[PDB]
Design a protein around this ligand. Sequence first.
Ligand SMILES: [Mg+2]
Ligand SMILES: [Zn+2]
Ligand SMILES: [Zn+2]
Ligand SMILES: [Zn+2]
Lengths: 168, 58, 93, 518, 262, 84, 88, 171, 35
Amino acid sequence: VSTSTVGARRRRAKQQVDDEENATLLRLGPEFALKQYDHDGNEHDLIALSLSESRLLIREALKARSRARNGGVIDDDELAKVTSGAVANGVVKKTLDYLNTFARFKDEETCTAVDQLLHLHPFEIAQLSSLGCEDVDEAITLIPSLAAKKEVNLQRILDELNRLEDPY
Amino acid sequence: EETVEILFEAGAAAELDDCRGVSENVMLGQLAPMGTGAFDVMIDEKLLTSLPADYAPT
Amino acid sequence: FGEMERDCMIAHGAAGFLKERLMEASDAFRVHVCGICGLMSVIANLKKNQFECRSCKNKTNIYQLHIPYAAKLLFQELMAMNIAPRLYTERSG
Amino acid sequence: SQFPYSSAPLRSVKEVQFGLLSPEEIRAISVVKIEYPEIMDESRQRPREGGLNDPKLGSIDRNFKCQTCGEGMAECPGHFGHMELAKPVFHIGFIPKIKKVCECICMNCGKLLLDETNPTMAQAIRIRDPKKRFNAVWQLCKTKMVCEADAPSRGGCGNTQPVVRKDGMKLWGTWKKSRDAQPERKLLTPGEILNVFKHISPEDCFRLGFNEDYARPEWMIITVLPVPPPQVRPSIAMDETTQGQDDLTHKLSDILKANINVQKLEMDGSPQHIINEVEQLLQFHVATYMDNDIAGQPQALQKSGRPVKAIRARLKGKEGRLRGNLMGKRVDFSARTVISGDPNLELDQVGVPISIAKTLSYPETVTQYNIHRLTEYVRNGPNEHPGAKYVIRDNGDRIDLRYHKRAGDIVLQYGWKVERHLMDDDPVLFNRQPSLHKMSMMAHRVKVMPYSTFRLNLSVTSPYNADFDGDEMNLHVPQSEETRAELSQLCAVPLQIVSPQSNKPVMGIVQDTLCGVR
Amino acid sequence: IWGVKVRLGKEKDVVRQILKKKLAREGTKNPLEIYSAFQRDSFKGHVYIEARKAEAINDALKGNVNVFSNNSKFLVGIVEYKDLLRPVKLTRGSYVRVKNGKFKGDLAQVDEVLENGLEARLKLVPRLDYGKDLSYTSKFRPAQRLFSEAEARVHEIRRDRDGFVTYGGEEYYEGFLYKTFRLQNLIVNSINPTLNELSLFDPTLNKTVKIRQGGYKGKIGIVKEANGDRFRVELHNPNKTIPIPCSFLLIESTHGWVPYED
Amino acid sequence: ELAILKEERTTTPYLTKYERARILGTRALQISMNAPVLVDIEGETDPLQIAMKELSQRKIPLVIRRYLPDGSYEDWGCDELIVD
Amino acid sequence: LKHGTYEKLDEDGLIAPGVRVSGDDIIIGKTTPIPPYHTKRDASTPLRSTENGIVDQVLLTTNQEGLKFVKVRMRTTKVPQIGDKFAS
Amino acid sequence: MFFLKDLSLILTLHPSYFGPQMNQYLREKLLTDVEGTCTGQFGYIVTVLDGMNIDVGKGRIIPGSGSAEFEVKYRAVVWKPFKGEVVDAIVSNVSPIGFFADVGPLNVFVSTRLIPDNLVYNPSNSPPAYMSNDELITKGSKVRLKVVGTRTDVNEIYAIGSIKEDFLGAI
Amino acid sequence: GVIAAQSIGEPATQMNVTLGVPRLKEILNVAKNIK
DNA sequence: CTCGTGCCTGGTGTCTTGAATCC
DNA sequence: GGATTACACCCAAGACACCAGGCACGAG
RNA sequence: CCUGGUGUCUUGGGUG
Ligand SMILES: [Mg+2]
Ligand SMILES: [Zn+2]
Ligand SMILES: [Zn+2]
Ligand SMILES: [Zn+2]
């Protein structure tokens, strides 16, 4: 039905088992290669999004479109009624509410601070932001790929994440 | 001519047929790149905008 | 509609007319192909709306074609003699 | 439109990739294994599973749905089976190429007898065309009469190579054992050659002009036979309740019987000289199943005495699949009758008999501008002219107006189609055989007339090389809005007055009118 | 031992002919110097001949019209001799497939064998009609169904024992036919049970019409099609079928041509 | 990429007989499927006639994509091509 | 069964002389039984689709094998018209 | 796991829709057909970016049928989960065979043989929960699980989790 | 292309050096030994 | 009543030796 | 040693054999 | 109360 920029995938003599999606082994399949191409043929890094980025973009896109539907005229339950159809109403409401209960940095002030702090494979950089951690010991266990990289700063990463983190 | 021999030989040497000939497309029943089929026809979205607004798709 | 009548329509450049004569006005047939291996090996249940090329384990990259029935017949006779005619819908160079 | 809706995207064919079917792939697309030559269960209706008419292969009967795709016989393409061979046999089409490969490679390990160190040979691998490269290589290596273990180690085995000769369906290799001594030529069985071919390296596979993904060289030996569905070999009823089988059906039974007897040998009484007679016979049946015009040996015969119609003979010649059904074919919406002249018709008109005009039709789409006009045709029905034969809905269901007794209760919706009778000024393509040049096919405007001949204005007899001594001509009716416009704007008679053949007219004033005008 | 190719089906004849030649020449100055000859059914189209010199093989076959004239004889190895002469089941309670008669192809249980050892009593699902059309072949037989003695009682029978009836001179015990077959008439090897065995074990059309008004008044015809109001009469007089309104017709009935009161 | 800019178009500025026939037929077809017609329809109600009327007034809303041998192409609108 | 009319056959399965026939009308009714009621299959002969005329004469007899055997001769009259061919 | 993907959809347009607001109709048409749907190749398509400004290109007219074919290139927010990815969740159901957890659009099933023995299902408690002493798994409790297997139905995808490993569970 | 083929073939169908059809045949068949 | 012979149906399987030019 | 040898169309005129086994009928 | 299948392979004689 719907297709992408990546095409053909004609048969090759040697098979491959670096295709099976394994986040531990950095296998994201043929569609989510490290170097993608946009609809003009230009080269582009894979766009993986943390929970904090994603909350701003999706909410902005929905209210800008909602304003556009109103000729140019906050709460998650109100923002999800913009969609068309009960099937669409469901997936969008559940995604905001899920993000509403797990996004630490729920505003653009803190988020841009986290944005500048983080901006080396692009997938790992996005993983560190999504999974909250206390110490260096907790990060290399649950995410065993950070082992043999020999470039920490990790502690100051976690300290800034936890300091920017508002109380609850 | 040499109909079957061509096709056996074509198999054994994995020939690729790029379907640019008239005869290729005729026997596969597709519009051949000749005469009225030598070009594509596109819809002029720019010229449609000069029509009045009550003709609009909803 | 013999070989010599085919040539006359080419000379007139009436490509559209020639296509219709040899398909819609005769033995037009719809086949399904696998986007990976290019064979007519798709098993298509249209009321259940489920398609599968078992060889490629592929249920998503599948296309339909309009070809003459006598061409479909030709390819099955070629398959029976171990010749693989793979129909791809895109070029690559 | 005659096809039910399917969500799969519609595309056209841009490339045809030829190649060979691997043994593994044949099994992957097969839906059943074929073992028993008895077609019927026990002559008590319903054909035997695992037999040659196993219902999983498909339906050629209007009342049994396919047990694989669920579709009716019209849509169901048929699905292949497979037949395992007890012993690998040669493909009859590829023997002379197999023979060529033997002189190129080592008959022990299978490596190309020459390297890039040889200057002329290094030039030959650069040749871009696979066929010419393969021939250029073989032209060099032909005279190399020993596979060297050592470079001129290259991976060689040191053995001298035989001179392989073809003797019918058998290949004989004569090895020169190390002046002159005694050489012993033994038979090079398919199984022996099969194992040798699988050990050819990928790098030498490419250099031989073969292709690792599409035409791998051991696939020229047949180990499992694809069983075509019944659509390829339909049954026919000679005198209603008596049906004979297609030549392929009988021939597949013979291969299947012969296959069982090879299994019947290796487990008990094999006097060796019997194994060679039974294996060669399996090779024979598989060969004449594909090609029954093998030079130098008698043809396989039916019990009627006439030769078996092999697959190769199905495709060649004037009546075969290519010249008889694909480069040309029989077509709908055509008509033919004797022609007569009429001076009181315009140059671009053709007089069409009423009876022909009621049989042919054009599917005119219903719009706001003609809906009132088209309803009048519907009330008149198929037997009064000007009338109509069918009303086609957007779903495709046709209403046959011969049998619709409540014809007065039809209301037409926009977008439907009415197949109305042929009517005045419709363009049609007119044609006389033999079509020697492009003005053998010109578009004329219909004028419906009584009596059963086609009428031509006399000045068009010359380009058709027609006269009225018994000649017949053909009429073809375009079936859509796009082709009507193509006929009137490209093929119409007045556009054809001057021909590019000799930059001069091909029509003039003729016969009576020319005599009289002087 | 040499093998020789012979016309299919003529192997026994060639063995016979060789024996006659041998016996006829015994003790003469030109004896046939072969020891034996034989033909194995499993080895179609071959005869084997025992001798010391190849010339004796040619001598044995000279003039034999069943032998291929091509110099096709072949030598057998000593290590292959005994296998040429290898001579080669059936147990009560086991299944076999019948090879002859209306029960051809049917699965049957072996009930017992004759004392002499030739025919075996088989237990079979019957194919009967209960004498329904009496005043059989394998192509015009009946479906299989267990014998029903009450159906036989109703429709057409001798009781012999508990659950045993003789019906039309065949024996049925607990619904099964018990019938003797030659052992050579049953298949005991490589039987494949089937799926089925696993389950078991307008009133004026076409009437003649006269036309009473119009240009065709007085002509005979037949109503070919009567969709509504407009009829299709196949006129007799010219080879044409016309469209005509219903007011114009007279129909034939018991008494003359009657208007639209029929 | 393949598309050639408007200022650098090199193919002939006259409508060819083949382009004309395809344009008339395609536009005719669309009208019979009840596409909005861009000219006044008076007495001439045949699908082909309406399409021929639109052509004569330079009002057919279609673009010709003329393929060149290498695969590149120039898009020409039927509003700008000169019809004899 | 065939699509044409069976109403011109008499009870003996044969049409009688003097009856006009048109295309696809059945003139000889014959059945064949279906092997293993409602057991037979039609094997009847229709008049050629392009013809008409009058049944002129019907021969009934038996052949060398003893089964029944019929011939039906149809006559019509052809009147010259536009398109017919003539020669000195 | 969220990504931004540049996608495209082939749209066929009937000729009766050839009016001055054609593009705006197509923009509405794209959104109705794509938003909220799932595919095994990309995952759930959550929202499309910059919907009212998408450049649809030019439509190819299909020979012989009159209808027009647009290739609408676009950019969307997509959500696909992955095997090996550790994620948080909100439990939707608790049953004798494990629990079901809503991670945004879909639901993940964790079976009993991959749950530690000390977490005991307690129906008598009010409200029902998986309980310990300093642990509390009620509906809405943050839990940390790891996706160990993805199965594809091409309509909705199904992922199976596990809490049979270190540092996974309630927090 | 096709126009060229018909333009040359059609006159041939109605038609001491060799001329007419036998000479035409020598050309297309580019015979090494002409008559 | 039993045995033998003839006819019909079904199943399986081949073989005495006997038009001309061109590439 | 094969492959090449105009196009389309109409219509009338034809079809497995031999051997073995089983069943039925007639005669003794 | 809608759907609705009648053969093939040759050979020979003809038409332009
Ligand atoms: Mg003439
Ligand atoms: Zn595939
Ligand atoms: Zn099927
Ligand atoms: Zn070697």
